[PDB]
Amino acid sequence: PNLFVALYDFESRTENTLSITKGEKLRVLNNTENGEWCEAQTKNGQGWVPSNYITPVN
């Protein structure tokens, strides 16, 4: 899968993270070696989010 949707709201102010809202669509482009964080892209930009806060649309 390449297209995902946010499962839960996630908000962070740190650099490189991306804020996402439940139901918001996102494309995943990369992840950490530990798999706990995913690099997501939305209409708001690109940044890192918790990998267990998203789920495939497919």
UniProtKB/Swiss-Prot annotation:
Tissue-wise expression: Widely expressed.
PTM note: Phosphorylation at Tyr-8 by members of the SRC family of kinases disrupts SH3 domain-based autoinhibitory interactions and intermolecular associations, such as that with ABI1, and also enhances kinase activity. Polyubiquitinated. Polyubiquitination of ABL1 leads to degradation.
Disulphide-bridged cysteine pairs: none
Location of Phosphotyrosine modifications: Y8, Y53
Protein location: Cytoplasm, Cytoskeleton; Nucleus; Mitochondrion
Coiled coil residues, start to end: none
Domain SH3: 1-58
Family the UniProt entry places it in: Belongs to the protein kinase superfamily. Tyr protein kinase family. ABL subfamily.
Its job: Non-receptor tyrosine-protein kinase that plays a role in many key processes linked to cell growth and survival such as cytoskeleton remodeling in response to extracellular stimuli, cell motility and adhesion, receptor endocytosis, autophagy, DNA damage response and apoptosis. Coordinates actin remodeling through tyrosine phosphorylation of proteins controlling cytoskeleton dynamics like WASF3 (involved in branch formation); ANXA1 (involved in membrane anchoring); DBN1, DBNL, CTTN, RAPH1 and ENAH (involved in signaling); or MAPT and PXN (microtubule-binding proteins).
Disorder noted: Leukemia, chronic myeloid: A clonal myeloproliferative disorder of a pluripotent stem cell with a specific cytogenetic abnormality, the Philadelphia chromosome (Ph), involving myeloid, erythroid, megakaryocytic, B-lymphoid, and sometimes T-lymphoid cells, but not marrow fibroblasts.
Assembly: Interacts with SORBS1 following insulin stimulation. Found in a trimolecular complex containing CDK5 and CABLES1. Interacts with CABLES1 and PSTPIP1. Interacts with ZDHHC16, ITGB1 and HCK. Interacts with STX17; probably phosphorylates STX17. Interacts with INPPL1/SHIP2. Interacts with ABI1, ABI2, BCR, CRK, FGR, FYN, HCK, LYN, PSMA7 RAD9A, RAD51, RAD52, TP73 and WASF3.
Protein name per its UniProtKB record: Tyrosine-protein kinase ABL1
Annotated gene: ABL1
